Amino acid sequence: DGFTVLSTKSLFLGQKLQVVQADIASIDSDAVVHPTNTDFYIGGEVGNTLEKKGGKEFVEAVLELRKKNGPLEVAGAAVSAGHGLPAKFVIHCNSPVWGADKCEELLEKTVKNCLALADDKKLKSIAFPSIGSGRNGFPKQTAAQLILKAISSYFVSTMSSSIKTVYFVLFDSESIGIYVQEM
Ligand SMILES: Nc1ncnc2c1ncn2[C@@H]1O[C@H](COP(=O)(O)OP(=O)(O)OC[C@@H]2O[C@H](O)[C@@H](O)[C@@H]2O)[C@@H](O)[C@H]1O
């Protein structure tokens, strides 16, 4: 595949939130978001697609980041170069596990931290997948509404802010099916 725009929303200053159907690895935004864990394990669904696309270049960048950063703190966001990928940078986030205490709040928090990091690097665009709803077990709709809520909230409260466009990237048929059905 593949690229379809499914929904577009105006954020607080008219910045655009686009929900799109695509493989996130194929998106050429300034940043793409990789949901990972404290050890930067590259074995979630999105991690596997980034590794498929970027190969060794991608993996060694993640390793170098783990060595420089140390373990990724709860809800933490960190950035590596997008070697092997269309995206300029990869923002790595410590994705909460469904069922862990305060897991919804932490999902919101991690999203905002990814946005702050992109802003700190003066990035114009950032692509999020449905963080938490793969290997970490969130229900797809719950994950998606938390992420979209957290992006909107960021832009209401952030004065500015270099981000022009936010992509919310859906790939699995269940997520797409529920997004479209329930909207
Ligand atoms: N090519 C793709 N593009 C965009 N989204 C995709 C793609 N493939 C799958 N997805 C969707 O990405 C969402 C996030 O899933 P994961 O990447 O598995 O992320 P998460 O559930 O947060 O957890 C992965 C994490 O990686 C570590 O190995 C592990 O500690 C943790 O489980 C899911 O809805 C999944 O269907």
Tab-separated table of N, CA, C and O in Angstrom, residues 29-76:
chain	number	residue	atom	x	y	z
A	29	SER	N	7.416	12.298	6.997
A	29	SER	CA	7.292	13.452	7.879
A	29	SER	C	8.645	13.763	8.501
A	29	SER	O	9.600	13.008	8.315
A	30	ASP	N	8.759	14.881	9.202
A	30	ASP	CA	10.001	15.192	9.898
A	30	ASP	C	10.280	14.147	10.973
A	30	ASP	O	11.425	13.744	11.163
A	31	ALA	N	9.239	13.697	11.655
A	31	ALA	CA	9.364	12.612	12.629
A	31	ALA	C	8.262	11.600	12.445
A	31	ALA	O	7.136	11.947	12.070
A	32	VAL	N	8.631	10.359	12.726
A	32	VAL	CA	7.704	9.273	12.920
A	32	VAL	C	7.923	8.732	14.329
A	32	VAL	O	9.068	8.752	14.855
A	33	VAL	N	6.818	8.304	14.968
A	33	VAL	CA	6.856	7.811	16.348
A	33	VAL	C	6.896	6.279	16.433
A	33	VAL	O	6.063	5.570	15.864
A	34	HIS	N	7.908	5.794	17.145
A	34	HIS	CA	8.123	4.385	17.425
A	34	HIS	C	7.758	4.074	18.886
A	34	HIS	O	8.469	4.487	19.800
A	35	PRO	N	6.642	3.369	19.103
A	35	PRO	CA	6.295	2.889	20.437
A	35	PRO	C	7.165	1.731	20.860
A	35	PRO	O	7.247	0.704	20.188
A	36	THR	N	7.841	1.914	21.965
A	36	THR	CA	8.816	0.953	22.407
A	36	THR	C	8.670	0.824	23.916
A	36	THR	O	7.615	1.174	24.447
A	37	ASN	N	9.682	0.274	24.585
A	37	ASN	CA	9.714	0.092	26.038
A	37	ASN	C	10.980	0.694	26.654
A	37	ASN	O	11.698	1.399	25.994
A	38	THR	N	11.239	0.429	27.922
A	38	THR	CA	12.370	1.049	28.600
A	38	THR	C	13.717	0.661	27.964
A	38	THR	O	14.660	1.462	27.958
A	39	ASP	N	13.777	-0.521	27.364
A	39	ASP	CA	15.024	-1.021	26.756
A	39	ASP	C	15.175	-0.722	25.268
A	39	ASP	O	16.137	-1.159	24.652
A	40	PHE	N	14.262	0.078	24.711
A	40	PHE	CA	14.237	0.412	23.294
A	40	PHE	C	14.117	-0.878	22.482
A	40	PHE	O	14.669	-0.947	21.402
A	41	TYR	N	13.406	-1.891	23.002
A	41	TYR	CA	13.127	-3.123	22.231
A	41	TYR	C	12.376	-2.803	20.937
A	41	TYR	O	11.315	-2.167	20.979
A	42	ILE	N	12.923	-3.231	19.800
A	42	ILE	CA	12.334	-2.890	18.513
A	42	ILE	C	11.328	-3.904	18.015
A	42	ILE	O	11.134	-3.998	16.790
A	43	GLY	N	10.615	-4.574	18.909
A	43	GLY	CA	9.767	-5.680	18.540
A	43	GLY	C	8.257	-5.525	18.593
A	43	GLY	O	7.564	-6.518	18.524
A	44	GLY	N	7.743	-4.303	18.681
A	44	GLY	CA	6.320	-4.046	18.463
A	44	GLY	C	5.965	-4.103	16.980
A	44	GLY	O	6.823	-4.334	16.128
A	45	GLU	N	4.694	-3.944	16.667
A	45	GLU	CA	4.247	-3.949	15.259
A	45	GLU	C	4.889	-2.831	14.437
A	45	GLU	O	5.391	-3.094	13.345
A	46	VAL	N	4.908	-1.617	14.972
A	46	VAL	CA	5.528	-0.476	14.284
A	46	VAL	C	7.071	-0.643	14.239
A	46	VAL	O	7.678	-0.470	13.173
A	47	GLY	N	7.684	-1.042	15.357
A	47	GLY	CA	9.120	-1.340	15.359
A	47	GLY	C	9.488	-2.320	14.242
A	47	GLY	O	10.440	-2.103	13.490
A	48	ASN	N	8.723	-3.392	14.114
A	48	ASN	CA	8.977	-4.371	13.073
A	48	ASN	C	8.846	-3.786	11.666
A	48	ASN	O	9.653	-4.086	10.810
A	49	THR	N	7.846	-2.947	11.431
A	49	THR	CA	7.717	-2.258	10.134
A	49	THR	C	8.857	-1.257	9.876
A	49	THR	O	9.309	-1.132	8.747
A	50	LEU	N	9.343	-0.574	10.916
A	50	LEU	CA	10.492	0.331	10.752
A	50	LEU	C	11.765	-0.469	10.425
A	50	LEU	O	12.529	-0.085	9.555
A	51	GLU	N	11.959	-1.588	11.103
A	51	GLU	CA	13.081	-2.462	10.831
A	51	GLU	C	12.995	-3.073	9.423
A	51	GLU	O	14.004	-3.199	8.768
A	52	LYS	N	11.799	-3.447	8.979
A	52	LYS	CA	11.599	-3.989	7.626
A	52	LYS	C	12.043	-2.934	6.602
A	52	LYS	O	12.810	-3.223	5.701
A	53	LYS	N	11.594	-1.703	6.788
A	53	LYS	CA	11.924	-0.604	5.890
A	53	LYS	C	13.384	-0.145	5.987
A	53	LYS	O	14.049	-0.060	4.973
A	54	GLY	N	13.855	0.188	7.193
A	54	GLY	CA	15.185	0.796	7.385
A	54	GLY	C	16.365	-0.152	7.587
A	54	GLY	O	17.531	0.259	7.466
A	55	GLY	N	16.082	-1.417	7.897
A	55	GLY	CA	17.121	-2.405	8.138
A	55	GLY	C	18.111	-2.019	9.238
A	55	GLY	O	17.773	-1.327	10.205
A	56	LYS	N	19.337	-2.485	9.050
A	56	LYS	CA	20.468	-2.333	9.963
A	56	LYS	C	20.750	-0.872	10.346
A	56	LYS	O	21.038	-0.563	11.493
A	57	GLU	N	20.652	0.019	9.368
A	57	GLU	CA	20.783	1.462	9.596
A	57	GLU	C	19.856	1.943	10.719
A	57	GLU	O	20.257	2.728	11.580
A	58	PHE	N	18.605	1.494	10.668
A	58	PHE	CA	17.607	1.861	11.655
A	58	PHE	C	17.951	1.271	13.019
A	58	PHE	O	17.905	1.972	14.033
A	59	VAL	N	18.281	-0.019	13.022
A	59	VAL	CA	18.541	-0.770	14.267
A	59	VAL	C	19.773	-0.212	14.983
A	59	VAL	O	19.731	0.014	16.182
A	60	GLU	N	20.841	0.067	14.238
A	60	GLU	CA	22.066	0.562	14.841
A	60	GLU	C	21.881	1.971	15.397
A	60	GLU	O	22.518	2.327	16.365
A	61	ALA	N	21.007	2.761	14.790
A	61	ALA	CA	20.655	4.093	15.314
A	61	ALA	C	19.934	3.996	16.667
A	61	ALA	O	20.158	4.801	17.550
A	62	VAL	N	19.036	3.025	16.775
A	62	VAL	CA	18.338	2.759	18.013
A	62	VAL	C	19.314	2.291	19.085
A	62	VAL	O	19.249	2.767	20.221
A	63	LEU	N	20.226	1.380	18.742
A	63	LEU	CA	21.246	0.921	19.678
A	63	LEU	C	22.120	2.065	20.212
A	63	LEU	O	22.389	2.137	21.438
A	64	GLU	N	22.594	2.917	19.290
A	64	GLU	CA	23.437	4.058	19.647
A	64	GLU	C	22.655	4.962	20.608
A	64	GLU	O	23.193	5.467	21.567
A	65	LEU	N	21.372	5.135	20.354
A	65	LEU	CA	20.528	5.965	21.243
A	65	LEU	C	20.397	5.348	22.651
A	65	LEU	O	20.541	6.035	23.641
A	66	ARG	N	20.107	4.054	22.723
A	66	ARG	CA	20.066	3.324	23.991
A	66	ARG	C	21.370	3.465	24.781
A	66	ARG	O	21.354	3.723	25.972
A	67	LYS	N	22.501	3.353	24.110
A	67	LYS	CA	23.784	3.514	24.770
A	67	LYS	C	24.022	4.938	25.259
A	67	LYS	O	24.573	5.121	26.315
A	68	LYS	N	23.602	5.940	24.499
A	68	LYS	CA	23.822	7.359	24.881
A	68	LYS	C	22.808	7.827	25.979
A	68	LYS	O	23.183	8.506	26.945
A	69	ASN	N	21.548	7.420	25.825
A	69	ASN	CA	20.434	7.820	26.697
A	69	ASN	C	20.370	7.032	28.013
A	69	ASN	O	19.953	7.559	29.023
A	70	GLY	N	20.756	5.763	27.968
A	70	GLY	CA	20.388	4.822	28.993
A	70	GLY	C	18.924	4.414	28.790
A	70	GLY	O	18.310	4.751	27.788
A	71	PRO	N	18.379	3.635	29.725
A	71	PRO	CA	16.977	3.213	29.654
A	71	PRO	C	15.981	4.397	29.576
A	71	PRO	O	16.213	5.475	30.146
A	72	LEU	N	14.896	4.160	28.845
A	72	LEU	CA	13.853	5.119	28.606
A	72	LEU	C	12.877	5.103	29.765
A	72	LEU	O	12.257	4.090	30.107
A	73	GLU	N	12.773	6.259	30.386
A	73	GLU	CA	11.926	6.447	31.531
A	73	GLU	C	10.442	6.371	31.094
A	73	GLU	O	10.076	6.549	29.920
A	74	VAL	N	9.622	6.090	32.080
A	74	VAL	CA	8.176	6.056	31.988
A	74	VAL	C	7.650	7.288	31.252
A	74	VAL	O	8.016	8.420	31.599
A	75	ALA	N	6.896	7.024	30.182
A	75	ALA	CA	6.302	8.037	29.309
A	75	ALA	C	7.322	8.898	28.524
A	75	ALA	O	6.957	9.896	27.902
A	76	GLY	N	8.588	8.494	28.559
A	76	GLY	CA	9.674	9.284	28.018
A	76	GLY	C	9.687	9.263	26.507
A	76	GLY	O	9.232	8.291	25.888
